[PDB]
Amino acid sequence: LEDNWETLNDNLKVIEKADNAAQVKDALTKMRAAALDAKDFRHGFDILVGQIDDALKLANEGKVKEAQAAAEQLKTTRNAYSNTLRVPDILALVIFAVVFLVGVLGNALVVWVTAFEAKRTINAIWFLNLAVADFLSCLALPILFTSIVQHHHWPFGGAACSILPSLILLNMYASILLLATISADRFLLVFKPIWCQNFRGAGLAWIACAVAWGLALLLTIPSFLYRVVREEYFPPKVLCGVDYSHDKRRERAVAIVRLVLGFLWPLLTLTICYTFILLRTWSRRSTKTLKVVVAVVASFFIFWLPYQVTGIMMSFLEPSSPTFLLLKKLDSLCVSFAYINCCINPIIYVVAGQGFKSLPSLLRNVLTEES
Amino acid sequence: FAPXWR
Ligand SMILES: Cc1ccc(NC(=O)[C@H]2CCCN(C(=O)c3c(C)cccc3F)[C@H]2c2ccc(NC3CCCC3)cc2)cc1C(F)(F)F
Ligand SMILES: CCCCCCCC/C=C\CCCCCCCC(=O)OC[C@H](O)CO
Ligand SMILES: CCCCCCCC/C=C\CCCCCCCC(=O)OC[C@H](O)CO
Ligand SMILES: CCCCCCCC/C=C\CCCCCCCC(=O)O
Ligand SMILES: CCCCCCCC/C=C\CCCCCCCC(=O)O
Ligand SMILES: CCCCCCCC/C=C\CCCCCCCC(=O)O
Ligand SMILES: CCCCCCCC/C=C\CCCCCCCC(=O)O
Ligand code: NA
């Protein structure tokens, strides 16, 4: 029953974005079957089916626009017809919750530990900045959680709609730029240690972090500007989302650039970096910090991959296609999986610490060692 | 238009 109801709405969207009568008719045929497949409830479905036949008659005559109008009136009838969340949305909620609790407490503890050594050790500066980016990202989670609980209703305003869903993308660019800087530092410690003795100081590390943060912000603005709220009417609510309407080329362009700058180019460059570093290390007779950073780097690509795959696929698909509709329903889940980046670092630090007393003292040993 | 992220 609940599955047939989604069949109706899915084909309803198909009609809304239909190019000809053939697609309208095909969609309407599937709606009829789904409606009949699904005494007071019988009447409602009966009114629905008749309206489908009305629209179906118009589409059979070849009148596409008139048939689509009759299909829009079908939505008015739907309101007269068990508001449970989709499976992917529910999993997103579970993940969101865990990431929030672990990420807020975990990264707050990291910031605490590394703040003290931040002017004494370069590594503390690196790990501090990664934690701050992860903590800040987690702050959006309660509001994202709430909106999904309220079936995507967004009562927080336009400003929050632009900012809060953007913090995960900010986290993407900030994390990977910081990791790029950390990786450059690791590379130089191993292959150009004379550079490190002449240059490497807390001052340069803080400047590199400033630039990394700044660049991340600039990379986030374009998508930030394309977020809008949208008011719905059946059932009435307010949605928060992205708007590349009448600009399918830009949607595709954004998706591709995000794939390259946010995933592919870092994957290439950091894998080269650590191939150099690991083969050097393994051919000779500091691994603690190195092992931690590799883990954090690895976890970045593991948890962003589904986001990136679904993102690219949707951009190359028509919005009326079954595969697009399926991927759309998975969007929140994919972002929730990406959000695991914002709680995974403290988990990594504690596990790496286990292989070495209290929790803050354990983080100190792992995160504030000097080279 | 598309709610959420994509
Ligand atoms: C989003 C993004 C991710 C990774 C990159 N990486 C690259 O271009 C790379 C450029 C080449 C160097 N590099 C490496 O990862 C790298 C290293 C280390 C060793 C050996 C081979 C390598 F390939 C990136 C890099 C870039 C900038 C910084 N530090 C700066 C100073 C402050 C902010 C960063 C550190 C490393 C670039 C972008 C960019 F440029 F698009 F923003
Ligand atoms: C250090 C040497 C480099 C400094 C060079 C000076 C840069 C500042 C001057 C103008 C910047 C304007 C940039 C405008 C480009 C942004 C447009 C854009 O990002 O498009 C987003 C699109 O929606 C997604 O694909
Ligand atoms: C299906 C969902 C699956 C989620 C499950 C994945 C969670 C990833 C967690 C950590 C990434 C670690 C990957 C392995 C990186 C650690 C290896 C390492 O630290 O390298 C040390 C270096 O080799 C010195 O010899
Ligand atoms: C060929 C495509 C390149 C993609 C990576 C782009 C940036 C790569 C920068 C340099 C790559 C290898 C750097 C080697 C530095 C050697 C220092 C040393 O070996 O001691
Ligand atoms: C939101 C993006 C634009 C803002 C980016 C700024 C990022 C800030 C990074 C570090 C700034 C503070 C520098 C640390 C000061 C103390 C360093 C020291 O005295 O040893
Ligand atoms: C250090 C600088 C890093 C440079 C990274 C190199 C990666 C290339 C950067 C973006 C290239 C993506 C191509 C954009 C496709 C746009 C599609 C379109 O406009 O029609
Ligand atoms: C996993 C290792 C492979 C990742 C390294 C690949 C790095 C790719 C660098 C830039 C590729 C540019 C992609 C061009 C996109 C074309 C967009 C379009 O044709 O519309
Ligand atoms: Na992280």
Helices (H) and strands (E) in chain B, counts: 0, 1
In a shared domain, residues A136 and A95: yes
Strands A236-242 and B2-3: antiparallel
DSSP per residue, A96-163:
HHHHHHHHHHHHHHHHHHHHHHTTT-HHHHHHHHHHHHHHHHHTTHHHHHHHHHTTT---S-HHHHHH
Strands A236-242 and A227-233: antiparallel
Residues with C-beta less than 6 Å from any ligand 5 atom: A 119, 202, 206, 209-210, 213-214, 217
Distance of CA A307 to the CA centre of its chain: 6
In a shared domain, residues A53 and A186: no
In a shared domain, residues A20 and A55: yes
Domain total for chain A?
A: 2
In a shared domain, residues A30 and A108: no
Structure tokens at A212: 């990394």
Q: Do A245 and B3 lie within an 8 Å CB cutoff?
A: no
Question: Residues in chain A, how many?
Answer: 371
Is the Cβ–Cβ distance between A21 and A74 less than 8 Å? no
CATH at A42 = 1.20.120.10
Is the Cβ–Cβ distance between A326 and A88 less than 8 Å? no
In a shared domain, residues A30 and A151: no
3-state secondary structure at position A196: helix
3-state secondary structure at position A228: strand
Residues with C-beta less than 6 Å from any ligand 4 atom: A 191, 268-269, 272
CA distance B3 to A93: 16
Q: Which residues of A touch B1 (CB under 8 A)?
A: 228, 230, 239, 241-243, 245
Place of tokens 């009417």: A233
- Asked if A259 is an interface residue toward chain B (Cβ–Cβ < 8 A), one would say no
Contacts of A167 (CB under 8 A, 6+ apart): A136, A137, A139, A140
Nearest residue to A300 (alpha-carbon basis) of A262, A350, A254:
A262
Place of tokens 């407490």: A105
In a shared domain, residues A1 and A119: no
CA distance A95 to A87: 13
In a shared domain, residues A2 and A144: no
- Beta bridge partners, A229, equal A240
Nearest residue to A208 (alpha-carbon basis) of A183, A191, A230:
A183
A260 Cβ closer than 6 Å to some ligand 7 atom = yes
Domain that holds residue A204: 87-367
Resolution in A: 2.2
Q: How many Å lie between the alpha carbon of B5 and the closest alpha carbon of chain A?
A: 6
In a shared domain, residues A28 and A92: no
Q: How many Å lie between the alpha carbon of A36 and the closest alpha carbon of chain B?
A: 30
CA distance A151 to A148: 5
In a shared domain, residues A53 and A185: no
In a shared domain, residues A197 and A312: yes
Q: Do A331 and B5 lie within an 8 Å CB cutoff?
A: yes
Residue among A168, A228, A242 whose CB faces B6 most closely? A242
The experimental method is: X-ray
Q: Do A165 and B1 lie within an 8 Å CB cutoff?
A: no
CATH at A253 = 1.20.1070.10
Backbone interruptions in chain A following residues (C to N > 2.5 Å): 38, 81, 285, 356
CA distance A319 to A297: 34
Is the Cβ–Cβ distance between A341 and A263 less than 8 Å? no
CA distance A256 to A95: 27
Q: Which residues of A touch B4 (CB under 8 A)?
A: 152, 165, 240-242, 331-332, 335
CA distance A336 to A168: 10
In a shared domain, residues A217 and A326: yes
CA distance A361 to A116: 12
Q: Do B6 and A230 lie within an 8 Å CB cutoff?
A: no
Is the Cβ–Cβ distance between A262 and A304 less than 8 Å? yes
Cα end-to-end span (Å), chain A = 63
In a shared domain, residues A9 and A116: no
